[PDB]
Amino acid sequence: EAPAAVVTGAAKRIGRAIAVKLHQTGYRVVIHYHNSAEAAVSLADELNKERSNTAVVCQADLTNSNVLPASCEEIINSCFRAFGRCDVLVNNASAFYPTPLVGKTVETQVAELIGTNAIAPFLLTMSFAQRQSNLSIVNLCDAMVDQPCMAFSLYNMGKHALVGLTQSAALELAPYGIRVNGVAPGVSLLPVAMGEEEKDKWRRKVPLGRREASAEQIADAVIFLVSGSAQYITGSIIKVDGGLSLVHA
Amino acid sequence: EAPAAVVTGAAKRIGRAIAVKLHQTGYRVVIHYHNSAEAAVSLADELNKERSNTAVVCQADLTNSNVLPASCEEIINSCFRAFGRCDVLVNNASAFYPTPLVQGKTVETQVAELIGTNAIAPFLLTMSFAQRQSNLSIVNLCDAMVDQPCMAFSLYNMGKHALVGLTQSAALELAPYGIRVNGVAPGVSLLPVAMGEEEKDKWRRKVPLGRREASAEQIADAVIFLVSGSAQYITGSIIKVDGGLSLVHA
Amino acid sequence: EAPAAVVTGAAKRIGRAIAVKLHQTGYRVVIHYHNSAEAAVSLADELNKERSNTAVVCQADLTNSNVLPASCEEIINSCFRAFGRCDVLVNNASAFYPTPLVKTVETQVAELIGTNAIAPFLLTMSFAQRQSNLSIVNLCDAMVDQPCMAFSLYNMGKHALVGLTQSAALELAPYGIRVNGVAPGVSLLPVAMGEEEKDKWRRKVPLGRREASAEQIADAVIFLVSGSAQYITGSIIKVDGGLSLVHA
Amino acid sequence: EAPAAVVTGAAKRIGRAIAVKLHQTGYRVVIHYHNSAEAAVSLADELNKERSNTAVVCQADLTNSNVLPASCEEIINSCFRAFGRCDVLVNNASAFYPTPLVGKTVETQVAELIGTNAIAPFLLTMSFAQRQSNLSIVNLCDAMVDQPCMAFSLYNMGKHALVGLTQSAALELAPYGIRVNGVAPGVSLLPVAMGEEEKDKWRRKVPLGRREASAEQIADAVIFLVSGSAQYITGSIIKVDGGLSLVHA
Ligand SMILES: NC(=O)c1ccc[n+]([C@@H]2O[C@H](COP(=O)([O-])OP(=O)(O)OC[C@H]3O[C@@H](n4cnc5c(N)ncnc54)[C@H](OP(=O)(O)O)[C@@H]3O)[C@@H](O)[C@H]2O)c1
Ligand SMILES: NC(=O)c1ccc[n+]([C@@H]2O[C@H](COP(=O)([O-])OP(=O)(O)OC[C@H]3O[C@@H](n4cnc5c(N)ncnc54)[C@H](OP(=O)(O)O)[C@@H]3O)[C@@H](O)[C@H]2O)c1
Ligand SMILES: NC(=O)c1ccc[n+]([C@@H]2O[C@H](COP(=O)([O-])OP(=O)(O)OC[C@H]3O[C@@H](n4cnc5c(N)ncnc54)[C@H](OP(=O)(O)O)[C@@H]3O)[C@@H](O)[C@H]2O)c1
Ligand SMILES: NC(=O)c1ccc[n+]([C@@H]2O[C@H](COP(=O)([O-])OP(=O)(O)OC[C@H]3O[C@@H](n4cnc5c(N)ncnc54)[C@H](OP(=O)(O)O)[C@@H]3O)[C@@H](O)[C@H]2O)c1
Ligand SMILES: CS(=O)(=O)c1ccc2nc(N)sc2c1
Ligand SMILES: CS(=O)(=O)c1ccc2nc(N)sc2c1
Ligand SMILES: CS(=O)(=O)c1ccc2nc(N)sc2c1
Ligand SMILES: CS(=O)(=O)c1ccc2nc(N)sc2c1
């Protein structure tokens, strides 16, 4: 009957809004989370109140390790066990912090930034395909991949690797009827780790309305890509950045 | 109170699917046409017998010339005259034919039709649409294969590349005015009617997603998204609708 | 003998520096010019003092018109007439000014799309028809995907030039003609453009502790023409000190 | 004295030709190798015969692991130990093999394809910069990165990451006068394994002369980017693919 979606990093911000809107469209949802157990459970409760047994939570650290393949396998399995099926994977979870070229060890930075942003999406993608009729994956990419922030080399590397994943998996999974696409926010919901006037510095850069994307605006692009309106769309990355990537220095 | 859209080359194929779909969505439409007089009127009638006073036609030759600005200005004017408003512009019209570099039209006619229809008319139409002024947006029909061009199509590929520049330049410039500019990029959709079935199946075979061409309705779907309220933060984006064709290596 | 190069808009700045540097490598040069007769001739004198009968000038308006194809064909003719061969085409001439969306528009079109894209397409056609290390180098723009505001016709023309670079590289490859581009960022800024505006640009350039220079451009063209680039076609080299990498 | 350069994977094929041609230009070279011990030693013999004291070898495995930072630090150190300086880093070493999405473990595959192709280049770059004239880094990328081979997702993801590193490190290292650029082969020396019939299928696709690049042709591009003729060039990736990436399906 109803289709089923996995959303990684679904407890807060963008992943939350994606999970909410998938749910409003008639998806059952696996809300993946890492540290945000309260917000994840609270979201599952709200959604289950909307419609019974349509939302489960699943905890997994998506850092790269010897166990990441098992964790990703488990995330996919939990969808099939809760719901009988897995139609949609949304790779949203993301680590994001500076790694200057010139405080964790470098190898922890690699495991986190490359782990969450690229390897976990690869492993989730393999598990999703292996366990397989409007089947699709949506990766959360970055509209500013080709004009990186200074001292974010590892973050930028993982986001570029994700673009490669989207294109590679689109090609290889097409014969199986699995579409693979991305959504590339520019400035959306801003990190809490920064002062509220730096917030205004970015908002001023945005040609369209001089404001950041709501999480819902990102979720709208995701909804379109999983829908029947995108049945011939694969390997495409839709920028949702109000024209920010187009602005020169 | 119903919004209105201009669609160029709207009589047949993809532009028709776009007008039909924008109409089913509640838009009043200007069906622009060049040579397809019968097909244009036929479509405007069928649309008008759904909701009356919703579909007008507008004839224009979108070849580059010293009257092209006036014709583009007139397409836009058609929309305000019939409907009081211009909410959407879909640049769909396009000439497509080989122009070999090492070699029955003069080169300057080729420049005029391939760069005229594919780039200059969209720039002039864009200028008039912006000057004439809400969810305002423009959608340019681009080409997914623009960076892997067919042999001998340099002028056509040039026009489509120009159209990407326009898409990005105008998104940037018109953002302050609340006009979004985005594009939709087909790979293989409806093959040229001149094309033999044997040739058609060569193209079908290339496409990773189902070994078939996009339907026109599938192209139109992406245009509907881009103009909708679900795309209110998207400007300067070009969405490929090519079932993965642009990703296949030689 | 000595190979021969056409360089359009060779009289001043970057096309001059490209012309001198190809000459220093042993090329014979057609210095094309439009309004720059005195500068063009002064260049050819300088190069002819160095080796006689190695530099000719040529006048053409590269604005798009019914006579553009004739003018372009005559540019390639001048190189065969004077030197018995044409080995290298450098598409450097370029018009540059704003065309806000909100001089007639069709003159804007004829200049911005004509000189920047259509003349390069016609010259490319004439070059190819009239044929070994043969190559064309198109002067492209590194900021092509981050355009300046109100520069739509300019930006359209430089995108069209990227499509030409790619389409011509593919189609001419079976003839041993390579087609490539060099994309400056800010090099020598418009001599009419103000002074505080020019220091503002240098300040954003990552490799900016250096002067951007016309010779740095020419170096990249010299590379692409050379036997060190015999396998390179359809490539566009940015020479912009990292400027295209900097976000807003 | 003469400036110096580290070339990774320099024992054979493309890395060898880069090493020869940098030596020809007057560089002192560190020939990094993993398994190819005979080849590496023999190349340093030939270069030292030409000009004594100009060529050392350095063995390291460039697989990602918690010791990869020390190995990368060691390759850099070894150039300072032999020559007192390190002017040029060429990231050439690379694993390359299919990883279908539908006898190595997946974590070894990630370690080799993402380790060698991206993480080791990032650590080498970090070590190179920390230890610090015309300083520059050249990464070996892939002209086919947006038209990947089917079932090469992990490889393609690593090469995509390498593009991000190139751009990210050009921007960040620029104030220190270090330029970072890439050279992107299409078809060059075909894998030793692969059959002669497979070799001609690939040769037939190349618009420019229906042939693969010689290793020397790739090296020429490296030479250009390290020289004084490329001093305003940073963040650029030069395709050396005879037009291959331009060819549609
Ligand atoms: N927000 C923007 O402006 C913007 C701009 C460009 C791109 N994006 C992209 O859009 C996506 C979502 O944006 P966002 O701002 O909502 O992301 P975010 O808040 O920075 O992070 C999203 C979630 O990812 C999960 N995560 C982080 N580290 C993890 C680890 N080691 N293992 C497992 N999960 C982990 C976290 O879950 P828990 O809280 O459960 O620990 C976190 O809440 C990301 O892929 C991001 O890169 C966002
Ligand atoms: N078909 C595909 O597979 C495909 C692939 C890639 C991109 N696209 C793009 O998608 C869009 C729609 O595709 P399509 O195949 O439906 O286009 P098409 O059939 O080739 O042409 C669409 C319409 O353009 C009009 N047109 C042509 N030259 C004109 C001129 N000088 N002045 C005014 N109008 C002119 C024609 O209208 P009249 O009939 O009134 O003369 C024609 O019916 C195009 O922009 C195309 O470049 C299509
Ligand atoms: N300088 C930069 O910052 C920069 C940045 C990005 C890209 N570029 C590209 O690099 C190239 C050369 O740079 P540049 O600044 O030296 O060039 P430029 O000074 O802008 O002009 C190049 C020459 O082209 C000729 N030209 C202009 N309009 C013409 C027309 N309508 N007909 C015929 N010839 C015409 C002119 O020759 P006459 O003097 O004979 O009239 C002109 O001096 C250009 O293609 C440019 O787009 C430059
Ligand atoms: N060949 C092509 O047609 C082509 C096409 C596109 C891109 N490229 C790129 O160009 C560069 C060189 O090409 P190539 O064909 O010469 O590469 P290659 O022969 O496949 O490999 C170069 C060297 O990398 C080293 N290497 C591999 N795995 C390693 C590990 N785990 N640790 C340390 N070193 C390791 C090997 O050294 P040992 O032999 O010492 O074990 C190997 O000889 C590569 O970056 C490649 O991706 C090549
Ligand atoms: C504040 S931002 O627009 O630079 C940005 C950019 C990317 C990003 N990824 C995350 N997981 S949060 C985040 C925030
Ligand atoms: C090569 S194709 O047949 O998919 C193709 C590609 C572009 C194109 N543009 C038109 N106006 S019709 C058309 C057809
Ligand atoms: C914006 S710029 O000043 O770097 C620039 C950009 C492009 C350009 N083209 C010319 N012919 S002059 C010129 C100047
Ligand atoms: C033969 S190929 O052009 O598919 C190819 C492509 C990439 C590659 N990378 C290596 N390290 S060897 C190698 C061979």
Automatic annotation (TrEMBL), chains A, D:
Positions of substrate binding: S136
Residues holding NADP(+): 12-14, 34-36, 61-63, 92, 94, 155, 159, 186, 188-189
Residues with PTM Cysteine sulfenic acid (-SOH): C58, C72, C149
PROSITE patterns: ADH_SHORT
Keywords: Nucleotide-binding, Oxidoreductase
Nucleotide-binding among keywords: yes
GO molecular function, one term: nucleotide binding
Pfam families for the chain: adh_short_C2
Chain sites annotated for binding NADPH: R13, I14, H34, N35, S36, D61, L62, T63, N92, S94, Y155, K159, S188, L189
Keyword Nucleotide-binding tagged: yes
Residues the record marks as active site: D142 (proton donor/acceptor), Y155 (proton donor/acceptor), Y155 (proton acceptor)
NCBIfam families (UniProt xref): pter_reduc_Leis
PANTHER family referenced in this protein's UniProt entry, alphabetically: OXIDOREDUCTASE, SHORT-CHAIN DEHYDROGENASE/REDUCTASE FAMILY (AFU_ORTHOLOGUE AFUA_5G02870), SHORT-CHAIN DEHYDROGENASE_REDUCTASE FAMILY PROTEIN
Entry's family note: Belongs to the short-chain dehydrogenases/reductases (SDR) family.
Protein name (database record): Pteridine reductase
Gene: PTR1
